[PDB]
Amino acid sequence: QKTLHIYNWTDYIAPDTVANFEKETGIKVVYDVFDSNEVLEGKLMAGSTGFDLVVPSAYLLERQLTAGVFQPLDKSKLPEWKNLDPELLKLVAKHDPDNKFAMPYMWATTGIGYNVDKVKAVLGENAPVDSWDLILKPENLEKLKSCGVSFLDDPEEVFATVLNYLGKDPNSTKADDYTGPATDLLLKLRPNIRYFHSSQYINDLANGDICVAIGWAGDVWQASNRAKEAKNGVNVSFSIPKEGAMAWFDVFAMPADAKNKDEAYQFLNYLLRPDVVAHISDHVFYANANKAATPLVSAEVRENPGIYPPADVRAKLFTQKVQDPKIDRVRTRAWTKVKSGKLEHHHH
Ligand SMILES: COCCOC[C@@H](C)OC[C@@H](C)N
Ligand SMILES: COCCOC[C@H](C)N
Ligand SMILES: [Cl-]
Ligand SMILES: [Cl-]
Ligand SMILES: [Cl-]
């Protein structure tokens, strides 16, 4: 009896995907979840993860590729590899040259999830829901504070979006941009932010407890769908704002010390089946990287331009760059300062 260990993002598979695989193959799956690239990266770099498959973002795979923590994926054991969109593979290959290490899973953007009616109640019918002004202009956050504001607990995403909003390179390599203007804005916003968290905001949006969030697209569409299924009268939407936004791929990868490689390839090949991955997209509201699967994805998902954005929106999207250690230090320090920004100090 063989057992396959998988480590994936929360809210990123259909409820029955694993059970269906277990029934088909007789392999027992131990499925665990994370909501942060930082948590996964730490485990990959500290020692053995004990996992057979993990799901980093592509830029994280790129950041640690030369550290040797992943092993190359034997495409002879992935007969359905051909189902992946070959043009999307060329884009992922910027992170994974010649697609040696990573299987593209889903693609999306980092934007604003919001309660349509509460935002309009607080900011008016002309609330700037097509703009980062909705959540990064202090005058707006002051008005939204009590209906609840959340930011992702992701320093790379948050600093990049703030830098872009301030008219800087979202991937600036200038330390002063982080310690100066980006920190200045974040500290002005901080008193109005209820929490920094990368997964609680889904149910909080769905239930009406948070009115604006920095969020990942499909997470927000899941919140919208949860509210609809609950018949709770809450209207959640998502915006890829006009100033641009981060875009990203998440990918499956195999840790270099994986125990059960054969079973892992069986699971990857299962995910390459068009019906399997389209069913996932239908439940998690994320675009997959499987060309063969597209016709099977629900119309509600395929036709949503916040899931599959058109070319004029894609032209405004940017990709996360891996930063040098000095920028990493200054960004991480600034993040800790921002998150602790409400605490009282006694040094004056
Ligand atoms: C409305 O269908 C769009 C078809 O897109 C091709 C698929 C394979 O790529 C999805 C991208 C946007 N992650
Ligand atoms: C990659 O293909 C999707 C094309 O969308 C382009 C829209 C019509 N502006
Ligand atoms: Cl409410
Ligand atoms: Cl990425
Ligand atoms: Cl449909």
Numbering used by the authors: 29 to 376
Anything the authors wrote about it?
We introduced the S247D exchange into PotF/D and into our high-affinity constructs E39D–Y87S–F88Y and E39D–F88A/L. The combination of S247D with the other constructs led to an affinity improvement with which the nanomolar range was reached for the first time, while keeping the order of affinities in the different mutants the same compared with the prior analysis. All structures but PotF/D–S247D adopt a fully closed wildtype conformation. This deviation puts extra strain on the structure of F88L and especially the distal salt bridge since R91 is in the affected region.
To gain insight into the evolution and designability of ligand binding and specificity, we analyzed the homologous PBPs, PotF and PotD, which are Escherichia coli putrescine (PUT)-binding protein and spermidine (SPD)-binding protein, respectively. Still, the protein-binding modes differ: PotF shows affinity for PUT and SPD, whereas PotD exclusively binds SPD. Prior to this work, we grafted the seven differences in amino acids from PotD binding pocket onto PotF; this resulted in PotF_SPD, which will be referred to as PotF/D throughout this work to keep naming for mutants more concise.
